[PDB]
């Protein structure tokens, strides 16, 4: 509805992520693996699940690709601004958001088919006793798909990454005010102001996702301990699989987006520093 | 296990509305695809339409808008209403279920009740081979289908049952002697070695373009 994330990881490469759709498809991705991993007889089914999820991605991409003309128009506008059409950028950005909301039910149909797939697997979940259900599927899944991600994030220190990004925005904010106060008679002063304004907003979205990753890492790590060397009653076993698939989905969404936004923040700072190399060269050649 | 059971009039006077209901037992309806497929005596299969997701519907234009599929989810039943019947509508009505449209195939089929009032060209309509022989059937679509092709085995008297989905992939229990192959327009089903448990009529199906169509079938018998 209003939970879209714009991402420019490379030069002239814009894309979007409908936050709720990402979490939803990811939740059912985890439900699927958890159901097939529970018993060894069904592990091999992951081949089919991987194939189906590829069909879901290819189908969803076909819907996103309808809004490609509007997206490529906004890419062309942003390209010109990275050299006054700031008002034209806002109207082309609103235009992209509009056709995304237009294809709302085309995306919903894909999401719903994904819910059905994972739910069918979830519904066929044997338990030899039903009063003692093996938590094997929970660990085999956790260990392969989720555990590794917990450790990469634990090592990263995402708060220092955020602190280093504020310093970048503060340096640019000071250079921007020193140019305005001292020598405002410069070319590309508006493009610096635009890039810094865009990078300030990217930072806030990274700041949001890192907050989620931080507590979700603690939650997942605490929860998994309790659903791992036990034997739940089928009803309770299924409840945990859903609960875990939920925690995994919120974590993977915010983690995936934070990394994508991180690349766009530093891609925009690369183009920003290209202009700073011009500004130092100009000031140096003038100083001759 | 999930089970579908159709219950209807079995005899409808011409131009009246045919009303059969299906009762989903041992499972919920929820957002699955609940279709009604009919089979005229001695003829092939026709998908009439389905109800899916939050009560959305899609019907076969051949039905001429006189078809309506509805669901009282609370009842856990879905039902068919076919207005202005003709002796054309004399058929065995199967109530069936697919899970998606992304990778559509029929998971469960009811017992089928007799009610008496893209071009999938399946190549060997009949075939009589000895046991052990390799039998190989062909299905050709009127246009591009990608690998959106399924194959069913309809045992004598029984409802059709999925053997291959997405042109080549076998369903979990189906024996390896069955082989799906093909993409785009030309598809081929092949039993590498004929078994006594194989005397059935096999049908192909497409799901690429919305009016879901079946093939002519191959009535396989022993010589």
Numbering used by the authors:
A (entry chain A): 158 to 240, 302 to 506
B (entry chain B): 1 to 117, 136 to 241
The publication says:
Blood-stage vaccine development was bolstered by the identification of a well-conserved complex used by P. falciparum merozoites to invade host erythrocytes. This complex was initially found to be composed of reticulocyte-binding protein homolog 5 (RH5), cysteine-rich protective antigen (CyRPA), and RH5-interacting protein (RIPR). RH5 plays an indispensable role in mediating merozoite invasion by binding the erythrocyte surface protein basigin. RH5 is not constitutively expressed on the merozoite surface but is sequestered within intracellular organelles and is only released to the surface just prior to engagement of basigin, providing a limited time window for antibodies to bind.
To enable a comparison with MAD8–502 and MAD8–151, we next determined the structures of vaccine-derived antibodies MAD10–466 and MAD10-255 bound to RH5 using Fab or scFv fragments, respectively, to enable crystallization. (F) Top and side views of the crystal structure of MAD10–255 scFv (red) bound to RH5 (yellow). Infection-acquired MAD8–151 and vaccination-derived MAD10–255 were even more similar, as they shared all five V(D)J genes, had identical lengths for all six complementarity-determining regions (CDRs), targeted the same region of RH5 (bin II), and had very similar potency. Aligning the structures of these vaccine-derived antibodies to their naturally acquired counterparts reveals that each pair bind to RH5 with very similar poses. An overlay of RH5 bound to MAD8–151 and MAD10–255 shows that these two antibodies bind with an almost indistinguishable binding mode, overlapping with a backbone root-mean-square deviation (RMSD) of 0.57 Å. Moreover, contact residues between each antibody and RH5 are almost entirely conserved, using the same residues from CDRs H3 and L2-3. Both antibodies make identical hydrogen-bond-mediated binding interactions with D331 of RH5, and several nearly identical interactions with residues F209, K212, N334, N338, and E341 of RH5. We therefore dubbed MAD8–151 and MAD10–255 “doppelgangers” because they have similar structural and functional properties, but distinct geographical and biological origins. These findings indicate that, at least in these two cases, natural malaria infection is capable of eliciting B cells with similar characteristics to those induced by vaccination with recombinant RH5, despite differences in the mode of antigen exposure and donor origin.
